[PDB]
Every structure is written in C-alpha cells, then in structure tokens.
Design an enzyme around this catalytic site. Structure first.
Site, PDB file in Angstrom:
ATOM      1  N   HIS A  38       0.806  -1.225   0.000  1.00  0.00           N
ATOM      2  CA  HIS A  38       0.000   0.000   0.000  1.00  0.00           C
ATOM      3  C   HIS A  38       0.840   1.275   0.000  1.00  0.00           C
ATOM      4  O   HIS A  38       0.278   2.378  -0.052  1.00  0.00           O
ATOM      5  CB  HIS A  38      -1.016  -0.009   1.158  1.00  0.00           C
ATOM      6  CG  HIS A  38      -0.453   0.231   2.532  1.00  0.00           C
ATOM      7  ND1 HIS A  38      -0.530  -0.710   3.539  1.00  0.00           N
ATOM      8  CD2 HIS A  38       0.083   1.340   3.099  1.00  0.00           C
ATOM      9  CE1 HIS A  38      -0.025  -0.208   4.654  1.00  0.00           C
ATOM     10  NE2 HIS A  38       0.360   1.034   4.411  1.00  0.00           N
ATOM     11  N   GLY A 140       3.032   5.717  10.244  1.00  0.00           N
ATOM     12  CA  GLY A 140       4.321   5.533   9.604  1.00  0.00           C
ATOM     13  C   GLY A 140       5.066   4.279  10.009  1.00  0.00           C
ATOM     14  O   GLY A 140       6.206   4.085   9.563  1.00  0.00           O
ATOM     15  N   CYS A 142       4.155   1.140   9.316  1.00  0.00           N
ATOM     16  CA  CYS A 142       3.985   0.019   8.399  1.00  0.00           C
ATOM     17  C   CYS A 142       5.334  -0.408   7.832  1.00  0.00           C
ATOM     18  O   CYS A 142       6.231   0.416   7.639  1.00  0.00           O
ATOM     19  CB  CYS A 142       2.998   0.399   7.292  1.00  0.00           C
ATOM     20  SG  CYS A 142       1.325   0.391   7.943  1.00  0.00           S
TER      21      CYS A 142
END
Ligand SMILES: *C(=N)[C@H](C[C@@H]1CCNC1=O)NC(=O)[C@@H]1[C@@H]2[C@H](CN1C(=O)[C@@H](NC(=O)C(F)(F)F)C(C)(C)C)C2(C)C
Ligand SMILES: *C(=N)[C@H](C[C@@H]1CCNC1=O)NC(=O)[C@@H]1[C@@H]2[C@H](CN1C(=O)[C@@H](NC(=O)C(F)(F)F)C(C)(C)C)C2(C)C
Lengths: 299, 302
Positions: A38, A140, A142
């Site tokens: 993503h 942030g 991920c």
C-alpha cells in the site's frame, strides 16, 4: 520476565520506501527490499484500491529506497500477495542468516518498531488466536517486522500493515499473506472475539512449578478430549497434538504429566484463585510460550 | 496506538560486547575504543569472592592473565587499571563499532534498557527502572555480569548501569560505568539486603495517562485534589511524593488528554484507598511504575 530478542541483526536491515509523499519502512536482505504494497497508494487510493492497476503504471524509477540518507536504486519490482519486492543494486552487507516463516496463533516474537526507516524501540508480543497482535504502532510504522532468532538465524514472521478499531494490529508474513481474514483496504473491519492461549498458560504454570510455586497442583488428571471441550466453555483455546508435544520438555523437567497440569488448570478455571497468586500475579499469563520458558530459564 | 513495555533497539550496544576470562571465571565486557570495561570481581576465585582484597589481587595479575574474546578473535590486553568496582583493560585494537556514547549516573525512577549477555553474546533486551531503594528488578543468570543498561538519544548511547550481583530477594544490584554501586551494596559474596522500596508515583501517573490515551478510562472521577493532600495519602501507602517538577513534566500528557494532573491524582488516590476491584488497567492487575512521563510521550505521541 518478558524479553525481546536483541534487535541488532534486524536494525541493520531496515530502510525506508517512498512513493510520491507516501513513506513507510522496508526490509533489506541481500539485494531485495520487502515492504507493504500500500506504499503505492494515495490517501484516496486506500479507500478502495486496485493494486494491479496501480502497479502497472509504476516503474522502477518511481520507487525511492533509502538506507539512512543513502539511496538504493531499484532495478526491478514485483508484487507477491500484499508485499512488494523491490530488487536494488546493492546487496546488504549486514544481511544475517535468515528465513521466512508463517507462525501459529500463540507463538511469540519480537517487534522492531521503526519510523522513516529508523528503529525506534523493540518489544515482545504474541499472535492472538483471532490473528491480531496487541502491538504498539503509530502513523508511519507500516513495514516494521516481527522476528525470532535461533542461533545466528533470524526467522522473520510478521510485517505490519494496519490497526483495527479496537486498537489491535494486523499484518502479513513475509510472503505477503495476511494473518487472519483482513485486507489492506481502508474499510470497516473488525477482529473476531479473542480467546486465551491455553498452551502458553500451561507453560507459565510449569514455570511457576520450576520456581517452587506449586500450590495449584491437584492429584487428578483428565483426558485431552475432555479438557478441550471444557476449555472452550471458558473461552480458552483447545490443545493440538503439537501443543502437547512442545510442552514435553517442561513436563519432563518437573515430572508433571501434561494432562495432570491440564487438570490443575481446569480446577483453576472452575474455582478461580482463592485470593492467591502464581509467580506474584492474580492473572494467568498467556504470552509466554514453552520455548520462552526454556530460553529464559536456561540462558 | 497500543502500549507495550518497550526497550531501545540494542544494536549499537551489541557491537560492543565481548567476553573476559580470568582463570575459570568468565563474564562480559564492554568494548569502547581501545578499552574494555568489566566488573572487577572477574579477578576473584571462589574463595576470593567470600572476602576480596581487590587491590592486592589486581597487583598480582598481569596483562596476559586476561583473556578477552571478541567473536572468535582474541584481543591482546596491553594495560589494566581499576576504577572503583570496574576494571578497565586497555587493548591494542580499537572497536570499529564504537558508537557515540557517554557515561551517566541515573536517579531512582528513571528507566533504561538492559541487554542481557552471556559469554560475550547478547541474549535478550528488556526495560527496567532504577528503584527508589537502588535495586533493579532484572532477569539475570550466572554469567550475566558485565551486561549493561543504557538509553539512546538520537545516535548517542548513554551507559548508566553495569550488572554485578543478585540479592536474596531476587532483585539485582550494580554500578555506573565509573564503578560506583547504586545503593548501599558491596561486591562481596556476603548476605546483603536492600532498604524498603517505594512506588514511583510520577511514573504511575504517566502510565494512567497512557491508559487514557488508549481508551482505558474506568478509573477516572469527577474530583480534584491539592498537591499536598495527594502527597499525604501517597506517602501513607509507601508511594513517593510528587514534586512540582513532576507535575510540570506531566504537562504534555495532561494537555493531550484534557485531564489536569491534580484531577488524575484524585483518581490515583481513589485507586490507593479502594483497590482496583479486580479490574485491570492496560491489561495489568497492578499499578505499573516503570514508565516515565518521557517514555509515555515518546510511545504515545512520537
Ligand atoms: C501504516 N503505516 C499504518 C499503521 C497504522 C497507523 C496507526 N496505527 C497503525 O498500526 N497503516 C494504515 O494506515 C493502514 C493502511 C490504510 C488504512 N490503514 C489503517 O490502519 C486504518 N485501519 C483500517 O482501515 C481498519 F480499521 F480497517 F483496520 C486506520 C483507520 C488508518 C487505522 C491501509 C491500506 C489499511
Ligand atoms: C555475575 N556473573 C553474577 C550474577 C548473578 C548470578 C545469579 N544472578 C546474578 O545476577 N554475580 C555474582 O555471582 C556476584 C559476585 C559474587 C557473588 N554474587 C552474587 O550475585 C551472589 N549474591 C550475594 O552474595 C548477595 F547476597 F550479596 F547478593 C549470589 C548469591 C551468587 C547471587 C559477587 C562478588 C557479589
């Protein structure tokens, strides 16, 4: 206590991956960087993404990969389930021995929480039976990974993708397959009802016995099938054959049969702890695995 | 969101750990530049530990009696001195992995990470606090001495602790990197007990704010209290007093949640007088006191 594995071998693999203004963390092993797909999404894209179409428009030169402020040039890209694999022009000199593993509910691992490719902290957690983890993750994060170390080998088992409304977290293995029935789309999703990890509670009771805390032992035993049916009534996980096997070493150390400890646990579940504690606690701990007990009690 | 006991990443310290052996005694050392730091009782035999004459024992040693191993490679000791309860071994090679670092002495209530090592090899990392009675509730086994505790600020490692011993109650005692013990303990194998401990009140309040930030609110109430009236009750229950500097340092958490510090104090007062009714806070059945206000801001805000 609950310890993390030393994080140095993973720290040396953390990078940042940026598409446009969207930035997250990636994992750099040999000449490949792994990260959540993503990253290729805008804010609006995430509400309803078409990943195949978003990647078709992408080229190698659209991906910014940085170790610190050093850029690593992307020379190939592909999508495997929900992870991107970016081939880069530099083999990571700090690559450790490693493997990718898919863990079972109840297994524990360490998480290296990272932001902008920069390691921030390390903590210990477990895969819940509802396939979420009770993590600690901010915007942030991920691409942060969960891992175990055996000998000199890092087994990577988790990469972080999202947070559910109840404040728990969901992610994939390093082949991009989600743990649980979750999808990487910004749409209403909910964790299933969780249960207590029975194999781990048992390991914790064995730990208690090893330390001389054994008031809870009774002179009875049960059948596995009888224990499993009662356990479910208290929202406890049933045991598998593999659970009974991994408790073998602790059963041998204490001389207490697995099914005898199950009988002692059942009495606890039926009558509670009469104002008594185990290892200084009124709550039964379920995020210490039998491996954790051995590792932390033998060094 | 979420809330975990979190340690600093340990990589920068792992690169400094080595093994130090004297005779049959082996423990860990900290290799910075061309110096290795380790507990001085490495020079003791079993009988020596029961009653050590440290300066005599060290004058009788020579550089070659010290076996220092980094990985699979031996480092050659070329000098050695003693600073309080710490031995400094000068070696003929500088550690290329030396981080930027400082030696600090922490105050009770402050937290730090511990990298537990055995035979110079890192084993686990966990978060601790300096207790008010100057012990730490660690997890240390035989061979763990010379493991260090540290904080990291930006890229700078602040070493604050080196492990030396375990007390009969199972708590631990050690020194700063200047070799001075935290607390009234000595590096001799004789029965030793710590003073009575207290709870770190400002840390408990920081953790209550963490529980609110994470949607755990059942313990809040509509009341406020004076700072002095709160401290009276706290000390009655063996909690440390709250200072005005503690009030100030909680400010940002108060601002984020909209809950005045003295409003939260009234909730903690009610918890102390009535218990938790078998309920939990952030999954704990006990009030947690090993998160500082800084720890909570860092983990809950960024
Ligand atoms: C990746 N850096 C973050 C990690 C999040 C942010 C706060 N805590 C975390 O663990 N992941 C995301 O922002 C993902 C990403 C889009 C939306 N998202 C979410 O985590 C959202 N959750 C959900 O949509 C839900 F509820 F279904 F889980 C959010 C509302 C932002 C928490 C995608 C692709 C899922
Ligand atoms: C360092 N490698 C060990 C670490 C110990 C081993 C068990 N858990 C720990 O943290 N330190 C020692 O062996 C030191 C060292 C001799 C004795 N010692 C102790 O920790 C002993 N404690 C005490 O004598 C007491 F009561 F004072 F704390 C022991 C009984 C072995 C735990 C010296 C010089 C203190």
């Amino acid at each position: 206590r609950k310890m993390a594995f030393p994080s140095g071998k993973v720290e040396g693999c953390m990078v940042q991956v940026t598409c446009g203004t969207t930035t997250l963390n990636g994992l750099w092993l040999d000449d490949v960087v792994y990260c959540p797909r993503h990253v290729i999404c805008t804010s609006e894209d995430m509400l309803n993404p078409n990943y195949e179409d978003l990647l078709i428009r992408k080229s190698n030169h659209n991906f910014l990969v940085q170790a610190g402020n050093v850029q690593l040039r992307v020379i190939g890209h592909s999508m495997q389930n929900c992870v991107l694999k970016l081939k880069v022009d530099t083999a990571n000199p700090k690559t450790p021995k490693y493997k990718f593993v898919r863990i079972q509910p109840g297994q524990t691992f360490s998480v290296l929480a990272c932001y902008n490719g920069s390691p921030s902290g390390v903590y210990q957690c477990a895969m819940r039976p509802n396939f979420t983890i009770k993590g600690s993750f901010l915007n942030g994060s991920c691409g942060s990974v969960g891992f175990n170390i055996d000998y000199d080998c890092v087994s990577f088992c988790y990469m972080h993708h999202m947070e559910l409304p109840t404040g728990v977290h969901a992610g994939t293995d390093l082949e991009g397959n989600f743990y649980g029935p979750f999808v990487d789309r910004q749409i209403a999703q909910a964790a299933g009802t969780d249960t207590t990890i029975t194999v781990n509670v048992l390991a914790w009771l064995y730990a208690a016995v090893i330390n001389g805390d054994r008031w809870f032992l009774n002179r009875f035993t049960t059948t596995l099938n009888d224990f499993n049916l009662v356990a479910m009534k208290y929202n406890y996980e049933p045991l598998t054959q593999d659970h009974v096997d991994i408790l073998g070493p602790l059963s041998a150390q204490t001389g207490i049969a697995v099914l005898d400890m199950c009988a002692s646990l059942k009495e606890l579940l039926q009558n509670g702890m009469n104002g008594r504690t185990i290892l200084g606690s009124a709550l039964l701990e379920d995020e210490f695995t039998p491996f954790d007990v051995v590792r932390q009690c033998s060094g």
